[PDB]
Design a protein around this ligand. Sequence first.
Ligand SMILES: [Zn+2]
Ligand SMILES: [Zn+2]
Ligand SMILES: [Zn+2]
Ligand SMILES: [Zn+2]
Lengths: 110, 107, 107, 110
Amino acid sequence: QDELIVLNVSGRRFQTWRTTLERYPDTLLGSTEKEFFFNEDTKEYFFDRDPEVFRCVLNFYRTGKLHYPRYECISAYDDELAFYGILPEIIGDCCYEEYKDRKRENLEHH
Amino acid sequence: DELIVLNVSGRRFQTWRTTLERYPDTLLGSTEKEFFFNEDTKEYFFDRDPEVFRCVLNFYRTGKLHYPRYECISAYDDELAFYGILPEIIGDCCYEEYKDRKRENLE
Amino acid sequence: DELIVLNVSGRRFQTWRTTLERYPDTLLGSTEKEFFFNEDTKEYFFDRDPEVFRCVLNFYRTGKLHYPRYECISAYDDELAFYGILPEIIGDCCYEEYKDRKRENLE
Amino acid sequence: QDELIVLNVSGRRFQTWRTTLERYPDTLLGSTEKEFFFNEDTKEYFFDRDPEVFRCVLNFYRTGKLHYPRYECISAYDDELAFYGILPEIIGDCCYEEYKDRKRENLEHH
Ligand SMILES: [Zn+2]
Ligand SMILES: [Zn+2]
Ligand SMILES: [Zn+2]
Ligand SMILES: [Zn+2]
């Protein structure tokens, strides 16, 4: 009874079990909202978003831990987290310190 | 509105026709891309770097142009130039980083 | 010999059956992978991170296990553990880097 | 008369004009050697190599400049360059300094 759904992000296809996405409701991917992005004549959801950051988002559902890839711009990252309804307070202790510095450095810009 | 396929060196990107249209005058938001459009495969083809194209494509989605820290500033500029996008529009979130790498480059 | 498809979260990797066989005892070089093998799509499926899998797969091709600098040391270890590969086998080219990031992590 | 060939690297498909690859003969990709990796019942060359580094290799043929992605291990990088028959002396002046430091740092290891 487990579906293997396809998440077409910007052309990049990601697959995960419907189960994995349901572990976290209230977020866009684990709550009916995602039905808003679905082409029935392809049988897949399409997201006109960044495919690179989505990997961290998806890895979150499957591990519970949200990491911060230090090659990514803190703004791009936050932008996507916002869209997916994931709160950056969920950032694992393993990545928090780095997220904290990058966020602070960003805040002191002009 | 509909999905268009942007094949960049074999890596296929998809977006909404209207996403690109948010910025005319630039290669992609123009009819200029139409010269890269293949009629048989029905997808646009670009013999360019697919990673910087990712950043260019994202600029159209968010209005923010980011500079991938891991990329060579030189390769980044060449690519930007091709898409008719000025480095000047790089976001404030990445400008500091961009200008530093460009400085270390000229030396 | 023949090509096998390793679908990792939708990202499909291909390699030679003999490439994986270079390391028995580990999940992939074993028959253990066979439990992830789907019979209808005829490809192995892994609900894991496709980027670290890239590094794991490369270890089979070159005998060298590299540590992607941009990856979280924690996410890297969890993944390594799943594939039955010991961080101890990380190459000398990446060990220095690996151990430093692991040190900064525990603190 | 220009072919669009497919380079299946580790499952990642790359496409470039036969023309682009010919700009640099003597290298594995621009010299008959590559015929050694070809499945006629797929009409594409397959390389059981790293897909990430191949992007720099391919960008080389199309621009003449060989860059060094600073997120990559210098050994992995050299390993691939060797396989593709590309000499690291071709590294653009834009990336040489960084390649030089990473190579030196590697040389002082144990
Ligand atoms: Zn982490
Ligand atoms: Zn930015
Ligand atoms: Zn290494
Ligand atoms: Zn460069």
